[PDB]
């Protein structure tokens, strides 16, 4: 997963779960990417499906 | 099953929109970006209740799309919920709408402006959406917008969450009632 096209001020919301290394399970690369953007860089991807 | 529930394609979970008909073929609506590469549709994370097949995907430009029944057994109920569905009708601006999503469950808000254009990225446009308060999270894609007895339409997407509030969209039912030519019952 590649977060470089974000922000996105909109996202469909499809369920395809992604771990955070915040231990919170993102329902989308979409959810997820727009968290990165917003935590300035600092999250990252744990690994796919819920945490 | 009903609107609002989960439904599993090869790829993720979506919600069912509204049971639909045309004579005697039953089918489901759901958001085109749903449908958009999935064949067969389940009714559990095990994929052990078949519920169907895409017969028609419409995303980006549009968000719509219809699965054809091909479970004999299972009841396909018109309504959202316990909620009876009767009609579909047009948004407008200031109309007390309510979703129904399998994330979420029921939440409720109001119109708040129609013929939105949504940029998903990518090229991934849509327009002619109905903008709303409403919240909505992954897993509630596709499903039922809608106000008393009347289907309005299928969540698209939108920003924020039900925690901190949000803004979502949703394709006008109609538009996808008339391309396929069915109906809600």
């Known amino acids: 997963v590649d977060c470089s096209e974000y922000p996105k001020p909109a996202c469909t919301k499809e369920y395809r779960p992604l771990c955070g290394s915040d231990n919170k399970t993102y329902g989308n690369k979409c959810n997820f990417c727009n968290a990165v953007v917003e935590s300035n860089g600092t999250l990252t991807l744990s690994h796919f499906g819920k945490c | ?185």
Request: net charge neutral; with cysteine.
């Open chain 2, 1 to 185: 099953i009903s609107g609002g529930d989960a439904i599993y394609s090869s790829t993720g979970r979506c919600s069912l929109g509204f049971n639909v008909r045309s004579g005697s073929t039953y089918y489901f609506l759901t958001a085109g970006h749903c449908t958009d590469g999935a064949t067969t549709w389940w009714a559990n994370s095990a994929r052990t209740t078949v519920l169907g097949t895409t017969s028609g995907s419409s995303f980006p430009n549009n968000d719509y799309g219809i699965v054809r029944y091909t479970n004999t057994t299972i009841p396909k109920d018109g309504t959202v919920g316990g909620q009876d569905i009767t009609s579909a009708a047009n948004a407008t601006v200031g109309m007390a709408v309510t979703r129904r999503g399998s994330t979420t469950g029921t939440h409720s808000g109001s119109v708040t402006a129609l013929n939105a254009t949504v940029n998903y990225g990518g090229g991934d446009v849509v327009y002619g959406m109905i903008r709303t308060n409403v919240c909505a999270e992954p897993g509630d894609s596709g499903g039922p917008l809608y106000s008393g007895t009347r289907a309005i339409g299928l969540t698209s997407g939108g920003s924020g969450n039900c925690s901190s509030g949000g803004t979502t969209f949703f394709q006008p039912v109609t538009e996808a009632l008339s391309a396929y030519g069915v109906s809600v019952y």
